[PDB]
């Protein structure tokens, strides 16, 4: 997916926030990896 | 209530550990005093 820079910190277990509240949330026992990078020069 | 869930879990671990080892201390003290009383009781039975 694509998110704004404001929500970048929001991707972590137990975090609140607009995306966390109503769009996308992580479990506490999430066993995985998170990768994100800027794409302003393309979008 | 007043903290993040993970930090609260870290906090609760402390209470868990403290109360658990305190219970262990009470149990050990009970064991020792039980040894005392049972030895004394058998002594009393022999006396009687």
PDB file of C-alpha atoms in Angstrom:
ATOM      1  CA  UNK A   1       0.000   0.000   0.000  1.00  0.00           C
ATOM      2  CA  UNK A   2       0.922   3.701   0.050  1.00  0.00           C
ATOM      3  CA  UNK A   3       0.653   5.937   3.119  1.00  0.00           C
ATOM      4  CA  UNK A   4       1.725   9.466   3.919  1.00  0.00           C
ATOM      5  CA  UNK A   5       4.820  10.303   5.937  1.00  0.00           C
ATOM      6  CA  UNK A   6       2.676  11.255   8.929  1.00  0.00           C
ATOM      7  CA  UNK A   7       1.519   7.647   9.323  1.00  0.00           C
ATOM      8  CA  UNK A   8       5.016   6.174   8.855  1.00  0.00           C
ATOM      9  CA  UNK A   9       5.646   5.848  12.581  1.00  0.00           C
ATOM     10  CA  UNK A  10       2.139   4.398  13.002  1.00  0.00           C
ATOM     11  CA  UNK A  11       3.103   1.002  11.555  1.00  0.00           C
ATOM     12  CA  UNK A  12       4.007  -0.866  14.750  1.00  0.00           C
ATOM     13  CA  UNK A  13       2.129  -3.198  17.119  1.00  0.00           C
ATOM     14  CA  UNK A  14      -0.034  -1.434  19.676  1.00  0.00           C
ATOM     15  CA  UNK A  15       0.146   1.955  17.956  1.00  0.00           C
ATOM     16  CA  UNK A  16      -2.930   4.140  17.632  1.00  0.00           C
ATOM     17  CA  UNK A  17      -3.671   6.587  14.819  1.00  0.00           C
ATOM     18  CA  UNK A  18      -6.079   7.102  11.929  1.00  0.00           C
ATOM     19  CA  UNK A  19      -4.817   4.160   9.870  1.00  0.00           C
ATOM     20  CA  UNK A  20      -4.367   2.106  13.036  1.00  0.00           C
ATOM     21  CA  UNK A  21      -7.828   2.989  14.339  1.00  0.00           C
ATOM     22  CA  UNK A  22      -9.867   2.505  11.165  1.00  0.00           C
ATOM     23  CA  UNK A  23      -7.697   1.293   8.311  1.00  0.00           C
ATOM     24  CA  UNK A  24      -4.862  -1.104   9.191  1.00  0.00           C
ATOM     25  CA  UNK A  25      -3.606  -2.575  12.465  1.00  0.00           C
ATOM     26  CA  UNK A  26      -0.820  -4.928  13.638  1.00  0.00           C
ATOM     27  CA  UNK A  27      -1.129  -7.699  16.225  1.00  0.00           C
ATOM     28  CA  UNK A  28       1.060  -7.771  19.309  1.00  0.00           C
ATOM     29  CA  UNK A  29       2.623 -11.105  18.282  1.00  0.00           C
ATOM     30  CA  UNK A  30       3.317  -9.917  14.724  1.00  0.00           C
ATOM     31  CA  UNK A  31       6.303 -11.940  13.473  1.00  0.00           C
ATOM     32  CA  UNK A  32       7.451 -10.153  10.348  1.00  0.00           C
ATOM     33  CA  UNK A  33       9.304  -7.299   8.701  1.00  0.00           C
ATOM     34  CA  UNK A  34       8.378  -3.731   7.775  1.00  0.00           C
ATOM     35  CA  UNK A  35       9.910  -1.895   4.810  1.00  0.00           C
ATOM     36  CA  UNK A  36       8.954   1.531   3.488  1.00  0.00           C
ATOM     37  CA  UNK A  37      10.479   4.159   1.244  1.00  0.00           C
ATOM     38  CA  UNK A  38       9.631   7.494  -0.337  1.00  0.00           C
ATOM     39  CA  UNK A  39       8.047   7.525  -3.800  1.00  0.00           C
ATOM     40  CA  UNK A  40       7.271  11.233  -4.192  1.00  0.00           C
ATOM     41  CA  UNK A  41       9.419  11.395  -7.344  1.00  0.00           C
ATOM     42  CA  UNK A  42       7.127   8.815  -8.989  1.00  0.00           C
ATOM     43  CA  UNK A  43       3.668   9.577  -7.547  1.00  0.00           C
TER      44      UNK A  43
ATOM     45  CA  UNK B   1      -5.030   2.143  31.679  1.00  0.00           C
ATOM     46  CA  UNK B   2      -2.533   5.001  31.743  1.00  0.00           C
ATOM     47  CA  UNK B   3       0.261   3.544  29.577  1.00  0.00           C
ATOM     48  CA  UNK B   4       0.994   1.677  26.369  1.00  0.00           C
ATOM     49  CA  UNK B   5       0.135  -2.011  26.520  1.00  0.00           C
ATOM     50  CA  UNK B   6       3.690  -3.328  26.099  1.00  0.00           C
ATOM     51  CA  UNK B   7       5.077  -0.999  28.764  1.00  0.00           C
ATOM     52  CA  UNK B   8       2.213  -2.026  31.041  1.00  0.00           C
ATOM     53  CA  UNK B   9       3.124  -5.690  30.515  1.00  0.00           C
ATOM     54  CA  UNK B  10       6.728  -4.894  31.400  1.00  0.00           C
ATOM     55  CA  UNK B  11       5.434  -3.186  34.543  1.00  0.00           C
ATOM     56  CA  UNK B  12       3.131  -6.077  35.490  1.00  0.00           C
ATOM     57  CA  UNK B  13       6.047  -8.505  35.265  1.00  0.00           C
ATOM     58  CA  UNK B  14       7.550  -6.765  38.306  1.00  0.00           C
ATOM     59  CA  UNK B  15       4.438  -7.243  40.438  1.00  0.00           C
ATOM     60  CA  UNK B  16       4.194 -10.856  39.311  1.00  0.00           C
ATOM     61  CA  UNK B  17       7.777 -11.596  40.323  1.00  0.00           C
ATOM     62  CA  UNK B  18       7.565  -9.787  43.643  1.00  0.00           C
ATOM     63  CA  UNK B  19       4.354 -11.412  44.801  1.00  0.00           C
ATOM     64  CA  UNK B  20       5.502 -14.839  43.628  1.00  0.00           C
ATOM     65  CA  UNK B  21       8.766 -14.762  45.561  1.00  0.00           C
ATOM     66  CA  UNK B  22       6.992 -13.336  48.620  1.00  0.00           C
ATOM     67  CA  UNK B  23       4.615 -16.297  48.523  1.00  0.00           C
ATOM     68  CA  UNK B  24       7.644 -18.577  48.287  1.00  0.00           C
ATOM     69  CA  UNK B  25       9.112 -16.977  51.410  1.00  0.00           C
ATOM     70  CA  UNK B  26       5.882 -17.507  53.333  1.00  0.00           C
ATOM     71  CA  UNK B  27       5.718 -21.140  52.204  1.00  0.00           C
ATOM     72  CA  UNK B  28       9.283 -21.841  53.304  1.00  0.00           C
ATOM     73  CA  UNK B  29       8.669 -20.281  56.707  1.00  0.00           C
ATOM     74  CA  UNK B  30       5.579 -22.461  57.083  1.00  0.00           C
ATOM     75  CA  UNK B  31       7.639 -25.531  56.208  1.00  0.00           C
ATOM     76  CA  UNK B  32      10.244 -24.792  58.871  1.00  0.00           C
ATOM     77  CA  UNK B  33       7.692 -24.129  61.592  1.00  0.00           C
ATOM     78  CA  UNK B  34       5.853 -27.304  60.595  1.00  0.00           C
ATOM     79  CA  UNK B  35       9.035 -29.296  61.140  1.00  0.00           C
ATOM     80  CA  UNK B  36       9.358 -27.689  64.571  1.00  0.00           C
ATOM     81  CA  UNK B  37       5.809 -28.474  65.627  1.00  0.00           C
ATOM     82  CA  UNK B  38       5.817 -32.041  64.326  1.00  0.00           C
ATOM     83  CA  UNK B  39       9.034 -32.938  66.128  1.00  0.00           C
ATOM     84  CA  UNK B  40       7.648 -31.425  69.319  1.00  0.00           C
ATOM     85  CA  UNK B  41       4.361 -33.289  68.877  1.00  0.00           C
ATOM     86  CA  UNK B  42       6.043 -36.671  68.527  1.00  0.00           C
ATOM     87  CA  UNK B  43       8.076 -35.829  71.619  1.00  0.00           C
ATOM     88  CA  UNK B  44       4.807 -35.127  73.426  1.00  0.00           C
ATOM     89  CA  UNK B  45       3.292 -38.404  72.265  1.00  0.00           C
ATOM     90  CA  UNK B  46       6.283 -40.334  73.576  1.00  0.00           C
ATOM     91  CA  UNK B  47       6.075 -38.472  76.885  1.00  0.00           C
ATOM     92  CA  UNK B  48       2.393 -39.279  77.278  1.00  0.00           C
TER      93      UNK B  48
END
